[PDB]
Design an enzyme around this catalytic site. Structure first.
Site, PDB file in Angstrom:
ATOM      1  N   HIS A   1      16.239  13.814  -8.638  1.00  0.00           N
ATOM      2  CA  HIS A   1      16.427  15.178  -9.115  1.00  0.00           C
ATOM      3  C   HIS A   1      17.491  15.266 -10.197  1.00  0.00           C
ATOM      4  O   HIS A   1      17.523  16.254 -10.937  1.00  0.00           O
ATOM      5  CB  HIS A   1      16.777  16.096  -7.941  1.00  0.00           C
TER       6      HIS A   1
ATOM      7  N   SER B   1      11.030  14.302 -12.903  1.00  0.00           N
ATOM      8  CA  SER B   1       9.964  13.316 -12.929  1.00  0.00           C
ATOM      9  C   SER B   1       9.612  12.900 -14.354  1.00  0.00           C
ATOM     10  O   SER B   1       9.726  13.680 -15.307  1.00  0.00           O
ATOM     11  CB  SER B   1       8.717  13.862 -12.234  1.00  0.00           C
TER      12      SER B   1
ATOM     13  N   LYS C   1      -1.188  20.494  -4.309  1.00  0.00           N
ATOM     14  CA  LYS C   1      -1.732  19.187  -4.641  1.00  0.00           C
ATOM     15  C   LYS C   1      -1.236  18.125  -3.670  1.00  0.00           C
ATOM     16  O   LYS C   1      -1.972  17.183  -3.351  1.00  0.00           O
ATOM     17  CB  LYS C   1      -1.385  18.809  -6.082  1.00  0.00           C
ATOM     18  N   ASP C   2      -0.003  18.267  -3.175  1.00  0.00           N
ATOM     19  CA  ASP C   2       0.497  17.338  -2.170  1.00  0.00           C
ATOM     20  C   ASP C   2      -0.188  17.547  -0.825  1.00  0.00           C
ATOM     21  O   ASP C   2      -0.370  16.584  -0.069  1.00  0.00           O
ATOM     22  CB  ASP C   2       2.014  17.482  -2.032  1.00  0.00           C
TER      23      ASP C   2
ATOM     24  N   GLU D   1      -0.644 -10.113   7.778  1.00  0.00           N
ATOM     25  CA  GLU D   1      -1.336  -8.892   7.398  1.00  0.00           C
ATOM     26  C   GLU D   1      -1.511  -8.858   5.882  1.00  0.00           C
ATOM     27  O   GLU D   1      -0.774  -9.507   5.133  1.00  0.00           O
ATOM     28  CB  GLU D   1      -0.562  -7.660   7.878  1.00  0.00           C
TER      29      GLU D   1
END
Ligand SMILES: CCCCCCCCCCCCCCCCCC(=O)OC[C@H](COP(=O)([O-])OCC(O)COP(=O)([O-])OC[C@@H](COC(=O)CCCCCCCCCCCCCCCCC)OC(=O)CCCCCCCCCCCCCCCCC)OC(=O)CCCCCCCCCCCCCCCCC
Ligand SMILES: CCCCCCCCCCCCCCCCCC(=O)OC[C@H](COP(=O)([O-])OCC(O)COP(=O)([O-])OC[C@@H](COC(=O)CCCCCCCCCCCCCCCCC)OC(=O)CCCCCCCCCCCCCCCCC)OC(=O)CCCCCCCCCCCCCCCCC
Ligand SMILES: CCCCCCCCCCCCCCCCCC(=O)OC[C@H](COP(=O)(O)OCCN)OC(=O)CCCCCCCCCCCCC
Ligand SMILES: CCCCCCCCCCCCCCCCCC(=O)OC[C@H](COP(=O)(O)OCCN)OC(=O)CCCCCCCCCCCCC
Ligand code: HEC
Ligand code: HEC
Ligand code: HEM
Ligand code: HEM
Ligand code: HEM
Ligand code: HEM
Ligand SMILES: CSC1=N[C@@](C)(c2ccccc2)C(=O)N1Nc1ccccc1
Ligand SMILES: CSC1=N[C@@](C)(c2ccccc2)C(=O)N1Nc1ccccc1
Ligand SMILES: [Cl-]
Ligand SMILES: [Cl-]
Lengths: 377, 75, 241, 377, 241, 75
Positions: free
Chosen positions: A199, A203, A225-226, A269
């Site tokens: 922050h 972004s 959207k999230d 894995e």
């Protein structure tokens, strides 16, 4: 307006509601919150497993069985936790790839602790896979812990000090369970520092160009959207839980641990196979271990290798191709890692192993210098 | 952090917007959507596909060799 | 380090994504385990009560538990003793420990079968192919006494004599107890033993797909609804001249 | 100056270094940091116990034994954790008493979540004392969990749902260990919100008068006083660990849990005896339980009972006497709680029980109204 | 719900805050447990190796472990068998479970003694007073057959016959094996059994007190040093007139 | 939070201070210290002591009664 002045809701406001965000961040920016969701799922499914699991070799295998058969809806909790861990690593690898392709690593503080967030998740899932105490759990735990024996002079002391004995046994399973319990909370704390540094700047976006001229509030645009992304995250998880729970799990882990003989072929894995391949690509003990460490710690020195006058690869075709040759090369190393040390997988594993380090350290840095000169600056 | 009203400087730019209850959320979803997906894949396929085709060829050769390298020869 | 032959895929009626187990075949498969397999193979994680409401009634499963004797105690004198099984007892182990098991089986250890389908690649395809796949050794392979040729077993030399054959038992519903029948029924039961949640997870899986088929386009529609303000916005630049 | 602008060290600076603090806060203000230290000690000793403890009735008693005899220096870790918990409750009760005497409760947000911090610590130490699985552990766990059976209609369902059975057994010991592991991290999170609301205003001081006219930086003045206080906190702990480890512990807890007979007289740890006395002071099931809840939830409504025009009791003699009659009364209820329900301890326990609620709800509110009129305002 | 008489405080040589156990008396006390008590009382949490370097040498403690036979196995045939004890074995239990114990002791259960001093108020003061405190019942108390009067036991009726008396054993160092001697030695050993860390904690306690006696005034001096700027500051108010 | 320079308003107040290396950290520790402790306890003892003496009297009476209430009487 109380949303902006209450000392508690102030920090929420400046992070999820009125936070300025770019108007053009694509689905590759959805994986930050999906990591948070994945973490929350692994906390909750993890917590409700820990109420029925016992941490000692005699009944550690049986207590997991007890969950999948006797406790109400514990089998679904357990596969959520197992497959949730794999979804966690899908999101991790998309998250990093987003950062490399679009150049988000120039946020040094955010990026460099992101590397730390990668290591601690690996350390968590490692100490989680030991707990059911199957064959793969035991010998996978044996191969890993012996990596420290390669350190000169102090190697064996650190291994036996980690072990609490002369091999992985009751004392390790107990402390590994304690570590697996506490680490996901440390992760959440560092993920909060991840956001704090983020922050500070806001972004990045697909173009690599400052979006200050055109920002939108996080709410309602990226809250929804999230949500949509999370609903596709639940879809991915539930398809694995409810239609293919043992697709990623190895069958050998369904036989209790035997400290006397190994399986003829062991495979981690999927989310660790690329790195296991790098380890086996070297016929030296200490060499293989160092090549394994630098395989992941290479991320810490990506920002020092940025040569382009542009930030994102969106306008850099020659870097795009080298970027996708790295994904294919990493997809190659994953394949070798799942295959036995035999011809020709051995020599392939070495060529793909050089190509990995060759791309990051040589081809991509110089590829950015070329395209700078093609653009006359 | 950073706030609205302290980001940057902008002049002489007009934005027209319509309410979301006045317009359609799926306008020409297939009419204009598919041709745009074709343009987007066409524009990037040559940069993404080759390395993954290269992986495909190594993958089939390597298994094909290994799958038969442990076959027996008359000698 | 020998050559391997992997099993083909048989069309089990529970193979499909939404396809439940056949519970009559489970019922028959339990009968195979009890009469034939339980004398060499343990099932340490299955109890008689797990049968209730899947393939036997409570009264049937209770009567089944009482057909064997199990150890209990101490009593008030400090002695252990034997009583008939109840629903809460796990299936009797054939040997107290694996060392006795090797001695009773020419040195080989019959594994516990609770999870056998999940601990070997190919599951019931492997087990079905193994049981029904015995044959004479090829030219040039001579196995030591005590061992039996089976091409699906790693190394092709297995310490288990063929355990099933025509008429090893008679089924309660009259079904012909052919080798292939016995293999199919015991394999279905072993799947259930390793994954009792099989049917319930597929029923949930169906509900999960249907809800997602509703919620995904509706949530998608909410995203597009809010975002439409931006997706159709128009810009114009009018600098002074 | 980087100490003031680095986004991470900024929050440290404004909390421990350049934070303005009053110049006159006495030793009663040292207990805030000692609570933090106590918490850290209970994390670390707790964590290193969890690496050797097993969570099932058959060997839960024996694994604690295994620590005190076989693991290097585990007996000292274990008594630190046991006595650390008791030091935690000493500091808690001084912390609260400081807040009442000097009127710090007027910080509603800080105070009201402080109450929450009290409940969660009690819930922690409760679920910690069950883990060794001695006699007191088992039946103390039985008395407490059955308090929920007093709730009308839904009582028994909540108890058996908490139990995972029809009595406290293997299923409870496993989940209680899971809860005891995770709660101290929740506590640390809420303790951070404790400070966040606190720094909104700064500290009160012995006089109840604003100290804005005379503040000093927290460093070096209160960093060193908090060190000195902590060194006296270590002294208190180590005297208990190294010279009297079983002084506060009951002998009955050294016999494995027996679900078939009780001890003739059960007593909680000292830090819960005052409240156990209030419970037993009523010959009614639901009445005793409600009187127990309100015994602690009385703190939430202290701020509503402030009548004085002055904040601290430093200048209020008539409130001082009623304050110390409450400490003696609470010290009385502690004594009754440690004694068997027999004559005359029964009737004493009821008189001291009324005096508790009588002081807080009647005598102290009206005592502040008197002294306002004695001062002509 | 009877009257209680609490034990007085005997001047054990380990009573003081800094006073260690007497290890010769421990040594004698182990001999009492082995010969007299171990036939009725278990000690499930003490092993032969714990004796090494406290009251016996390694060779002595090894020889002591081999004087009893313990169960081990399975061997390669799956059978359990007996071998002599080694240092890693816990002290043999006299009974397999408590139900056998009640039957062998007229219904009463001799508790495990590993922690006996810590699980009863008064510790060795209680145990010393109990063993040496038997006497004839007072007028009007008539105990049922099987039970024995002991005024320190709650209820005054205990199911243990007096277990020690003059000459129950002979000590290795010639010490007269008087009842009071036997009680004192066995009590010291039982303290060690319940708190093997006793001596080491007191040595640490001494170091902790000495360091605190140094660090407390020095840290106090640092506090006063910094604060002296404020404690001697002088104020003056000079308003305009 | 709150910062130095934004707390409050003060005027016409002078503060003299001495360096900590120029003065003594324990000046008249017993000469002036003990008389101050006597004044401090004297000033508050009447407000603190009575309720704890009241507790002491109840504590001895209650135990004294209980300790002998289970004694026997000839009846
Ligand atoms: C692990 C989990 C990973 C999570 C990933 C996070 C994804 C995310 O959060 O963003 C979703 C992100 C949102 O896309 P968007 O909001 O439409 O905006 C796209 C751009 O504006 C681009 O504008 P456009 O006009 O080029 O859009 C093209 C159009 C696709 O164009 C088409 O019409 C292709 C469909 C061909 C079908 C032919 C039938 C006739 O939309 C899409 O690209 C989405 C494809 C989804 C199709 C599902 C079927 C409906 O993209 C998606 O993948 C949507 C999938 C949602 C499922 C809907 C099911 C109903
Ligand atoms: C559970 C753990 C709880 C932690 C509590 C936190 C305590 C804290 O952080 O503040 C300590 C706080 C600091 O006091 P301070 O910095 O001297 O300032 C006191 C006021 O200025 C008051 O000024 P003042 O002039 O009235 O001071 C009187 C003087 C005490 O006046 C005396 O001289 C009484 C001593 C009589 C001995 C007669 C021999 C001749 O100082 C004291 O009150 C401290 C008593 C400690 C005496 C230790 C022996 C030296 O009070 C203490 O309890 C100091 C104890 C430190 C141990 C020193 C051992 C050497
Ligand atoms: C270290 C871990 C190793 C583990 C091995 C994992 C196995 C690998 C399996 C491969 C799966 C690949 C996922 C599918 C990617 C499809 C991307 C594509 O369709 O579009 C290319 C896109 C170009 O779009 P522009 O942003 O340039 O502009 C758009 C203008 N309309 O450009 C972008 O969208 C690219 C953004 C980044 C993609 C993330 C994928 C990379 C995953 C691993 C990276 C790890 C590196 C250390
Ligand atoms: C709910 C939990 C119950 C558990 C039961 C616990 C058992 C209780 C055992 C009692 C121990 C008492 C500790 C010793 C207190 C001595 C105080 C004293 O010496 O001085 C009185 C002081 C007066 O000083 P002024 O601040 O008015 O001005 C000073 C001018 N030179 O005034 C002050 O310093 C008073 C500050 C506050 C003291 C804190 C003690 C209270 C503890 C429990 C309170 C719980 C209430 C819900
Ligand atoms: C019901 C008819 C049975 C089924 C299904 C299986 N068996 Fe057996 N078994 C026996 C021995 C001595 C072994 C060990 C062999 C070795 O380790 O070499 C086994 C092992 C198996 C296995 C494991 C195969 C593998 O590891 O890949 C399976 C899947 C299996 N058995 C299936 C002995 C006996 C036996 C004693 C006479 C009987 C009655 C059965 N087995 C019955 C069944
Ligand atoms: C070494 C000489 C011994 C010591 C020290 C103690 N005993 Fe025993 N013991 C025996 C029985 C049948 C009981 C149960 C009695 C009952 O529950 O009523 C006990 C119990 C004890 C106790 C517990 C006292 C208490 O609970 O307050 C102690 C402290 C104790 N014993 C000390 C039987 C026997 C026995 C069988 C012949 C022998 C040899 C010993 N006890 C020896 C010792
Ligand atoms: C538990 C681990 C992690 C969590 C919860 C997490 C979460 C997030 C979130 C929510 C964002 C902002 C939204 C977004 O861009 O999606 C973000 C951004 C970022 N993360 Fe992470 N992340 C984690 C691990 C990592 C790793 C492993 C790396 C790199 C090696 C990393 C580097 C970055 C960078 C550079 C950004 C800025 C991206 C941008 O704004 O363009 N993080 N992270
Ligand atoms: C980012 C967080 C986490 C990750 C990636 C993770 C991952 C894993 C994985 C891969 C396993 C192996 C499962 C299996 O093979 O069956 C596992 C097991 C386990 N985990 Fe976690 N875990 C996380 C957090 C937690 C937490 C917070 C807890 C408890 C409070 C927890 C409790 C357990 C338990 C008890 C097991 C053993 C039971 C089992 O195997 O299913 N986990 N974890
Ligand atoms: C884990 C629990 C707790 C921790 C770590 C904690 C810590 C602290 C700290 C460090 C301070 C500031 C320094 C000080 O005054 O000592 C403080 C102040 C305060 N606390 Fe707590 N506390 C806890 C529980 C409580 C409880 C149980 C209450 C009340 C029921 C409470 C109410 C307050 C109040 C009113 C203040 C302001 C005191 C003042 O500045 O005058 N807190 N706390
Ligand atoms: C504020 C924090 C905590 C408090 C007040 C607390 C308190 C206690 C108490 C009173 C006991 C009983 C000890 C006994 O009777 O022997 C106990 C036991 C235990 N605690 Fe905690 N605890 C805290 C945090 C933790 C944490 C964070 C962990 C682990 C990560 C932990 C692990 C354990 C374990 C394993 C035991 C059982 C071993 C034993 O009884 O000594 N504790 N705790
Ligand atoms: C402890 S066994 C184990 N833990 C995993 C989940 C892991 C390892 C390393 C880092 C994160 C997660 C994994 O793949 N394996 N298996 C395995 C098999 C062979 C060799 C090494 C590991
Ligand atoms: C679970 S046993 C228990 N946990 C403690 C430490 C506790 C209880 C309640 C709240 C915090 C801590 C306590 O005093 N007891 N004992 C005990 C004895 C009799 C009745 C109740 C508890
Ligand atoms: Cl499993
Ligand atoms: Cl214990």
């Amino acid at each position: 307006n109380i949303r902006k002045s209450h000392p508690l809701m102030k920090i929420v406001n400046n992070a999820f509601i009125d936070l300025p965000a770019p108007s053009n961040i694509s689905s590759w920016w959805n994986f930050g919150s999906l990591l948070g969701i994945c973490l929350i799922l692994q906390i909750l499914t993890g917590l409700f497993l820990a109420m029925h699991y016992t941490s000692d070799t005699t009944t550690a295998f049986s207590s997991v069985t007890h969950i999948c058969r006797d406790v109400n809806y514990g089998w679904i909790i357990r596969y959520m936790h197992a497959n949730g861990a794999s979804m966690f690593f899908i999101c991790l690898y998309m998250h990093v790839g987003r950062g490399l392709y679009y150049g988000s690593y120039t946020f040094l503080e955010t990026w460099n602790i992101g590397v730390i967030l990668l290591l601690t998740v690996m350390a968590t899932a490692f100490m989680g896979y030991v707990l059911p105490w199957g064959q793969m759990s035991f010998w996978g735990a044996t191969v890993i812990t012996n990596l420290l024996s390669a350190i000169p002079y102090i190697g064996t002391n650190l291994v036996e000090w980690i072990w609490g004995g002369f091999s992985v046994d009751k004392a390790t399973l107990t402390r590994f369970f304690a570590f697996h319990f506490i680490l996901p909370f440390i992760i959440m704390a560092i993920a909060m520092v991840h956001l704090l540094f983020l922050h500070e700047t806001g972004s990045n976006n697909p173009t690599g160009i400052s979006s200050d001229v055109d920002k939108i509030p996080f709410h309602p645009y990226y809250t929804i959207k999230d949500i949509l992304g999370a609903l596709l995250l639940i879809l991915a998880l539930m398809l694995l839980v409810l239609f293919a729970p043992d697709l990623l799990g190895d069958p050998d882990n369904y036989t209790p641990a035997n400290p006397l003989n190994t399986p003829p072929h062991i495979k981690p894995e999927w989310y660790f196979l690329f790195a296991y391949a790098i380890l086996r690509s070297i016929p030296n003990k200490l060499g293989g271990v160092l090549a394994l460490a630098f395989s992941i710690l290479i991320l810490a020195l990506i920002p020092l290798l940025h040569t382009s006058k542009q930030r994102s690869m969106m306008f850099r075709p020659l870097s795009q191709c080298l970027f996708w040759a790295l994904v294919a090369d990493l997809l190659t190393l994953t394949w070798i890692g799942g295959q036995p040390v035999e011809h020709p997988y051995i020599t392939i594993g070495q060529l793909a192993s050089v190509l990995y380090f060759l791309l990051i350290l040589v081809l991509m840095p110089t590829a950015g210098t070329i395209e700078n000169k093609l653009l006359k600056w | 952090g950073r706030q609205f009203g302290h980001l940057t400087r902008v002049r002489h730019v007009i934005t027209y917007s319509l309410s979301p209850f006045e317009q359609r959320a799926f306008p020409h979803y297939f009419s204009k959507g598919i041709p745009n997906v074709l343009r987007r894949t066409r524009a990037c396929i040559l940069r993404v596909a080759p390395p993954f085709v290269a992986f495909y060829l190594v993958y089939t050769w390597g298994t094909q060799e290994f799958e038969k390298s442990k076959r027996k020869n008359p000698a | 380090s020998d050559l391997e032959l992997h099993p083909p895929s048989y069309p089990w009626s529970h193979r499909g994504l939404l396809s439940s187990l056949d519970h009559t075949s489970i019922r028959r498969g339990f009968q195979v385990y009890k009469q034939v397999c339980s004398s060499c193979h343990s099932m340490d994680y299955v109890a008689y009560r797990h049968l209730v409401g899947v393939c036997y009634t409570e009264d049937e499963a209770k009567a089944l538990a009482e057909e064997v004797e199990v150890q209990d105690g101490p009593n008030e004198d400090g002695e252990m003793f034997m009583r008939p099984g109840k629903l809460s007892d796990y299936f009797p182990k054939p040997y107290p420990n694996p060392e006795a098991a090797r001695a009773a089986n020419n040195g080989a250890l019959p594994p516990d079968l609770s999870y056998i389908v999940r601990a070997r690649h190919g599951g019931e395809d492997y087990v079905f192919s193994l049981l029904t796949g015995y044959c004479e050794p090829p030219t040039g392979v001579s196995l030591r006494e005590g061992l039996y040729f089976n091409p699906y077993f790693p190394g092709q030399a297995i310490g288990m004599a063929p355990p099933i054959y025509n008429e090893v038992l008679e089924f309660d519903d009259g079904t012909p107890a052919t080798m292939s029948q016995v293999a199919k029924d015991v394999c279905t039961f072993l799947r259930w033993a390793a994954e009792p949640e099989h049917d319930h997870r597929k029923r949930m899986g169906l509900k999960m797909l249907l809800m997602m088929g509703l919620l995904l386009p509706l949530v998608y529609a909410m995203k597009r609804h809010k975002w439409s303000v931006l997706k159709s916005r128009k810009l114009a630049y009018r600098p002074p001249k």
